Here is the input.
Amino acid sequence: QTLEQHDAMKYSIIVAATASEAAPLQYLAPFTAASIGEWFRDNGKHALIVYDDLSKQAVAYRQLSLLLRRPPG
Amino acid sequence: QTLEQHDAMKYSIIVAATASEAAPLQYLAPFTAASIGEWFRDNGKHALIVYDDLSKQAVAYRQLSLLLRRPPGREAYPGDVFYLHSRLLERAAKLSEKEGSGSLTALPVIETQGGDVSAYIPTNVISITDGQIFLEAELFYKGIRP
Amino acid sequence: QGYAAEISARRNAMDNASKNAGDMINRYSILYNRTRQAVITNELVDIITGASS
Amino acid sequence: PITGKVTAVIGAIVDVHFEQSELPAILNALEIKTPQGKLVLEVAQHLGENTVRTIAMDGTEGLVRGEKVLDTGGPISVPVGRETLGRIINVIGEPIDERGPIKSKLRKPIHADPPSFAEQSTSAEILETGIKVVDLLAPYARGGKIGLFGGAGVGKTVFIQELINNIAKAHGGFSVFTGVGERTREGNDLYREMKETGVINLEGESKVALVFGQMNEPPGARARVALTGLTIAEYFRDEEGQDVLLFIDNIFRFTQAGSEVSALLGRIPSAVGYQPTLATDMGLLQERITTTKKGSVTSVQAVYVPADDLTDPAPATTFAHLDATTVLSRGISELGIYPAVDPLDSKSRLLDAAVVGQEHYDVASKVQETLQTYKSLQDIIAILGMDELSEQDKLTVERARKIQRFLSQPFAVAEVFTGIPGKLVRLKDTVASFKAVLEGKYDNIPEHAFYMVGGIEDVVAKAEKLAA
Amino acid sequence: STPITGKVTAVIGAIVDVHFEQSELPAILNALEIKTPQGKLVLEVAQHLGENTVRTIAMDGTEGLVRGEKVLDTGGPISVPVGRETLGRIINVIGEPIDERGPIKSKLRKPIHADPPSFAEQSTSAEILETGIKVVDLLAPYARGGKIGLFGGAGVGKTVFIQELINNIAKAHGGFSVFTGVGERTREGNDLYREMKETGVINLEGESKVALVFGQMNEPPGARARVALTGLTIAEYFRDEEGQDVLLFIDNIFRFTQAGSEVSALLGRIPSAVGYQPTLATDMGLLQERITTTKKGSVTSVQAVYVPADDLTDPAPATTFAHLDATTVLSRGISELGIYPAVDPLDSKSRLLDAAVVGQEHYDVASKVQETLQTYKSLQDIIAILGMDELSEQDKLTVERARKIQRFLSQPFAVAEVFTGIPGKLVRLKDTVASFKAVLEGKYDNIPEHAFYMVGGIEDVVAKAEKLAA
Amino acid sequence: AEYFRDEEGQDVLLFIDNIFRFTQAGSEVSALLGRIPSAVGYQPTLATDMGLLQERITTTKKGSVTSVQAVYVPADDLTDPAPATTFAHLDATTVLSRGISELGIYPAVDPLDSKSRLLD
Amino acid sequence: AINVGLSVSRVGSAAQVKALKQVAGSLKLFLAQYREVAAFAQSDLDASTKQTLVRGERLTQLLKQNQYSPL
Here is the structure.
């Protein structure tokens, strides 16, 4: 909404993977977004991507990793 | 090369297990070194055996145990590491005057990475030994080198 | 005159020290907390590897 | 529906093996007939081969492998409506208070999916109360999460009661006080107290509905009580379009109980000794709380710190979700100021220039600034002495002390104790008062004559009465 | 039918599994014996894993255990020898003599296990031990019935402390004793064995005043565990059937805790308290209850205890602190300062200290001491920063008496003639009470600090005032 | 390195940025491999593997391979097994902490955490 | 709200063209000169440190901006 008041929503993409949403959706959230960004990139065009916040992605993946018995750090 | 310069090789024996060489041979090097020392002891002669460092023997034995499936203990070291250190260190005995009074002397060494004394291995060695010759990092700086 | 300045001065110095030590109590408190949290996680993991094997 | 025999009873983890066709879906509610009442078990895995793995909501005792089980067809259904208010209900939606079966026209499941993207709080909203301190310096919002801090029995009860009272006047609304980690001795006292202060009436309808999750009921009954109160709130929001305020008790004991639920199911409890599915569970809980087009549930939640740490995983996950913090303390109460609110520790992320208009923000900044400057000055003003005050400096002292007293509400909940008629001071009227004090148009009115009054209107009276 | 044949199935260190035949029906706490070149390896059954297959702990070497080699079933726990003719001989963990003078004489035998005496059997203390060490005697004395514990780190003279008590107390009392060595070095055994042979506590004829039971650490972790159960059994025999007080001694009882921790993980029992056996409370509990005063004998143990990392807020010492009646705390610092022993004055505490049991005067004097030292320690902070001349005159005098008291803990020992070289002293309980009191009353602040350094009893304190003056 | 050392008879030199990566990837593959992860999370086959790589660029009589090995300190803990077993194969160090890098000090070498046996 | 004392840019540092070269050839190094003077002020009583101090204070005040209104 904030973007749509200031006239700028139409040149941005928003990807959502909320906290109510299942653990693989959050995990796969950054990798998918970057696929759209690469398509803009490889047409020689300039682009940007903000991955907010990757630490919560690390958490989303943690549950998966812990059940997959992969070492803890 | 320092020993050969100072002429200390004609009574010295060097037992070795370098890092590249296998974990079995790394475990086995203190215990095979013990025997060379014991021969002197038995005959009524004297020796002194430096076992530097035993903390890395524990890591050798850890690798060994976990890939034969012996459950990790406190800090991943197996629940019988103390038994290794105990059985080795006590072969630094003196004998009765029938046997000639020969004694193996031992100097074990524990190279500690953080300097934590609440780790399992450093504790384990302290009990076994009759004395401690604490060396500290700070005192190196202060101008006592070594 | 000197003795009065001295007793006044020690009040001033020692006040600034109360604040200086305080700034440092708060900094070592942040470390203390972080440090306890890591110990708890590292304790836990040892049990987990054991149960699992 | 389909029937099957209990094929395990390890811990409070009961697996039930069903006649071959299919198993219950996940999250469904199963009912066990036994001479221990009923035991409602909730499916949290499918082991395959028509077998399940469940968590318990009722103590696991008087079970035998071979007892017949029944599949309801979905989550545990709790009653909803306005015939359930002022009555205490446990996790299955049935009385603890023993006032006769708690039933209503409709029931709804404890687990629900959160509303669409379109139907979330998408623009700012303001939830008006009667307290000056909350409404100026931390504005309660609709679909807003405000995490309460401080202990119980120094003002905490008075604060909860007040807001329940304000809501009826403001909208016609309701509240549901949900107690997680509730002690049964304390629970009777809260229901009797809540009757006395006029927010629960022994004859028909009331305001707040009480949901208690005792500790002598398994970890799941502590966990699902939060969901049990939510369903009630939502019924008002969706089908009667009324705004609600949903309290939670301690969020440590929501965390404490969830760790057990994790560890037990097969999963690993690692997250510094707590569940790894913690964030995702708060995500489900606090994203069904929001402003829909017909109504809105707002949530006040309570933070309990594990050992005085704001750097732990459980405080941290909570602090991200929370949009304001209200900070009751005892120091304030001992200076005869009820609410117990700390205006120095009253903050919101919905206190902005564009969220409450420009005027509201800019008065709040000054009101904050006076009190901050008064504190800095006060350090050396006490030590140096109260006569080593500047002309400039004593201008800051004077303004602050006028503001400090003026905040107090002689409000209806704590009316008995001071003896002074109740007050509700609306958000617009809070802002307006603060404007005249800023320009010093009441520097003819003594400092102490701002004592126990609300809005601008109110302090006209006290000024006269002090002189008289 | 009970097979007398088992074939070994898995040697994985100390853990030895056996494959017994049809009908055996295994039972825990039995003893399996395997013929071996190193004698008879004893295995104490500590699990049956089902279908006639035990998982056992070894008490002897398994560096020569051959698989396929016949395993007899003996049944129950092993049986050691007890009597009065079992004194002043060195008895192995499997019950065999390593002092090599034919077999260890018998009348009767009992097993290394014993059930713990019931509530009805228990009875209170009424006798008061006097060690002859001035710090122990004033600020925490022991009483017969007690489970004394010598908590300290390393380098605080643990063996020497234990040695001192035998030099005095052991001769004195009318009873016999038992000395039990759990997991200790080959130097320490020999040091104990020579020193007390000479002192006549060990004699080649039986009916001595100590027993020796040496179990050592170059023997598998199970042996270190059941050296203790073996010595203890000699003491129960004294207590009940032969009706004599024992002044039991065990050394180091951490080797007993540490031993259980090693075979705990391997038996499948996942560690608890972080790196320790989950059965820590009950193994201790069983051990401690056997050592008590009942309807006849009073078996009052003195147990050495090792605090790891010099930190006593760690779970292994803390659990133990509860289990022991009359704790003392020792530390590196005090020992190095010249104050013998390294026992701390405020941290030596008994649950057997009452104001009536040790008498009112004694109690009042030891309390004054506890106060004066505690003021001294509060004042240390003030003295570091503020200086020593910004103390009140009452305070300055308390500093001064506390210094005199602090050096009044220092007494040399005979068995610490490897430190000072000045023989030991014997100090009577009444003499400690009277000389400390005198300092505190302000009538004996004419005496300097160094004349309380290196003294016995009262007579000594007077003698040292003269010597320094000249 | 071996090709230059032996065959071509040369004294070589060597730079590595970072050998922590070697250690860390091997820790990821170890669970899958059939191995029980040791204290912290690192692999149990760690010492043997690290030794071999640093003895494959050793001081031979045909060529002397001077190495500069950078191990990125994990989570600001330099006592952990990946940087610690590195010291075993070393005679000199110049230990760098971030704090001293940020204040405006390049090179970021701790002066109070450096030791050498190439100093006498 | 960015500290340039804690921020750095390695081989990512480039976005400075002539305009932003002349006017200051990186304002961040100078504002890590301010950090020193203000370190030991709370440095010199000499006009040099006080000139930097006076610049650094003015500059810190000048940064202050309003949220979601860029320039």
Remarks:
- Chain E has twelve helices and 15 strands.
- The interface with chain C takes residues 265, 270-271, 274 of chain E (CB under 8 Å).
- The CA atoms of residues 52 and 190 of chain E lie 43 Å apart.
- The two ends of chain E are 87 Å apart (CA to CA).
